[PDB]
From a paper:
Topoisomerase II (TOP2) enzymes are essential regulators of DNA topology during DNA transcription, replication, and repair. Topoisomerase IIβ (TOP2B) plays a role in transcriptional regulation and is expressed in all cell types including post-mitotic cardiomyocytes. Both isoforms catalyze the reaction, where one DNA duplex is passed through a transient double-strand DNA break in another DNA duplex. The ATPase domain of TOP2 is highly conserved between TOP2A and TOP2B and is composed of an N-terminal strap, a β-hairpin that is unique to eukaryotic TOP2, a GHKL ATPase domain that binds and hydrolyses ATP, and a transducer domain that conveys mechanical motion to the DNA binding and cleavage core of TOP2. Here we describe the development of the obex class of TOP2 inhibitors that bind to a previously unidentified druggable pocket in the TOP2 ATPase domain to act as allosteric catalytic inhibitors by locking the ATPase domain conformation with the capability of isoform-selective inhibition.
Numbering used by the authors:
A (entry chain A): 28 to 345, 350 to 418
B (entry chain B): 28 to 345, 350 to 416
The structure:
Amino acid sequence: ASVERIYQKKTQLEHILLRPDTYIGSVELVTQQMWVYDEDVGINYREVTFVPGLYKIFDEILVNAADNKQRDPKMSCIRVTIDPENNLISIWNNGKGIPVVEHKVEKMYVPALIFGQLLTSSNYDDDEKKVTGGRNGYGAKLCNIFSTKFTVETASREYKKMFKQTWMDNMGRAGEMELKPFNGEDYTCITFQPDLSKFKMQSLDKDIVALMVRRAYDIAGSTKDVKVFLNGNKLPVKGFRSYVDMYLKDKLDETGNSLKVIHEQVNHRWEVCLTMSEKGFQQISFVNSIATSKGGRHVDYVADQIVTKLVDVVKKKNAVKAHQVKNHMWIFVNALIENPTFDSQTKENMTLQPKSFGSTCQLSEKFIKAAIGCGIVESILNWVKFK
Amino acid sequence: ASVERIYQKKTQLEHILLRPDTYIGSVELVTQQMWVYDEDVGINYREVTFVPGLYKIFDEILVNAADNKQRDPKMSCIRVTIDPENNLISIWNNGKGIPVVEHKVEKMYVPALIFGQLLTSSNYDDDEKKVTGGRNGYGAKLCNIFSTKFTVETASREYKKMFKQTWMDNMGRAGEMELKPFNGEDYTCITFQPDLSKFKMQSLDKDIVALMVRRAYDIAGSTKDVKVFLNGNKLPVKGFRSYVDMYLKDKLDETGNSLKVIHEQVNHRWEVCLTMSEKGFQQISFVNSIATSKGGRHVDYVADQIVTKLVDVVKKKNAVKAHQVKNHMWIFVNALIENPTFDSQTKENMTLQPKSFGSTCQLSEKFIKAAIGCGIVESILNWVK
Ligand SMILES: Nc1ncnc2c1ncn2[C@@H]1O[C@H](COP(=O)(O)OP(=O)(O)NP(=O)(O)O)[C@@H](O)[C@H]1O
Ligand SMILES: Nc1ncnc2c1ncn2[C@@H]1O[C@H](COP(=O)(O)OP(=O)(O)NP(=O)(O)O)[C@@H](O)[C@H]1O
Ligand SMILES: [Mg+2]
Ligand SMILES: [Mg+2]
């Protein structure tokens, strides 16, 4: 009844733990069909039960690793370790480390600042037109906050130093900072034990591991010239087309014939695959190696030029609407977008208008022709016949 | 390229202005089809060009007014003023005012705290199972931050005082707090001048007004026993079914016949209308008077029990998929949900699972029967043939 009990102020850290949803997604169970990678089965679509926020904190660190390839093209490798019985995840990358030096304005070492303080980022100057996935200065701190133990190790040959420090108890405490002389090949390694109590979980079970492994395959398929290892084993992905092939390799439509798959690497920032869908519009897409599971204007931009060209082919053969065409399409898009926007930190839907992408993606006349002859025009014409 | 230039830390306020999208949505132009209310023809679906974030800061204040009906059910009225020429918006409501008193913990007057300080809310104790739209403690400060001038006035007969304070320059400064004795009918009035430069706009033009006006119609239809006024004109909505009718006034399908509409007020927290769609699945829904324009589990919870009963009807008469059924559905849902969750501050998609809703919505067998007899079972059954 008290004014002080009714009206409350929260610190930023308190607010994240109290209201996790707009930061990392739901911290409750969801049961739905998802693409996952099962041991001994590979890529497959099945019902899974998982906590989105746990999936996301892993994603934040993984995308950070991919981002470093854009910062340093000499980077060649990402190594992911998932150890359920010790509740341990590690993500390692090479290329240039984080400067191991005191930040003259914030008065702490750079790695401690950008992993241990909210709203810290190298991505706050949008006069630079970057195709990194990082935008907001939260992601790594979010993983820290939802971890019981969160270790940052980064080595900077330029500064001849190596940094290592561990946070604990939801970024509430930090152990001792370790600084050692260094003169090798740079790397960064983030090792964390997710706070499964925040997710009402007891361990990294089969389903969340299958999702995390598939996400590592996503990275292998969406990045260029980065080898990806999962628990010491190299992942056999070479390019986005070979990644898409894992989804469609033996796939048949419902009459029994194999799916017709249309591909174009339109340019160095856009790659597209199209086939037929029997369950409504489907899209699997990436922006700067972020899995945009709810799509966005990058998907609309590519799909719409297919749809309008197909509605024009169907009209020649007569009343059909664009949503009808789109419901027969399964599209794959891998895109690099400058300074993308999203309506949430989880970055599931990319909202930037095409005029601001920094590149274009006009599908070739070769691609469009093959799209006309891939079964979508057929199914539509049988429906208007059977009217 | 110095380390201090590369790696930067932002205050919360700086971060909101630098990265508005996760707080209020896009601050750039968007062109798409929207339901609006034009001073010409009324509710209608047409292409508009508008800035989502400007639309959103208006919504935050409007939903706050609607929230006060849950706080004080004797509240009866909301009045909205939109004045493009002076770039001024006001939202007024009656019912209980904000307590005009010094907060013993934060050591400022309550209205100053909850309109001038980030992460402040009456909605942070989830042991109270409330059906208010406010959850995060941002909305009103976001409107303040994206305004050149932002004025709060609230009168509390209980505290026998009236409060008034004005912020300016993106919540960068505040004027003086004005306190006067008060002994009339409580009210709260929020008046703001949106910072149109932040939205790269020149004035509150035709399209953004039509969106704001339809949103005021939304409030009149989603709330109970609240009259809604816009520029002194009462909005002629009484109950959710009458609001849905404004969408269905032009009631003809593509065959020429009048639209068949199935309705049920399931309980005090759920009201559902269903009609047919020829443009794919459509949903218009609200959670605690939030316009959930991207839907959510409240929509799924309702639509799915319609779909599953229809899929069971087509089997009797035969391989059909659920998306096929859904594509012929245009559904309206007005729900009150306890402590809802959302993907983003903009609250366009409600993510809370049904087991946590705090109520159920099992559609009546009469509703289901009428839904079986609406043409959706018909067209699909000829399709499988
Ligand atoms: N593996 C890494 N290698 C090099 N720099 C890194 C790495 N991970 C993080 N960083 C740096 O640490 C900063 C903070 O990371 P993070 O908190 O994830 O924010 P962000 O990536 O910039 N934006 P976001 O992820 O959208 O919230 C980044 O901006 C990078 O400068
Ligand atoms: N018109 C109003 N009448 C009464 N109380 C109000 C009114 N507007 C705001 N408040 C109070 O001010 C607080 C701050 O509002 P706001 O910043 O919108 O946060 P919120 O509504 O609690 N959550 P959110 O909108 O999801 O960020 C609310 O929790 C209310 O208690
Ligand atoms: Mg990041
Ligand atoms: Mg609010």
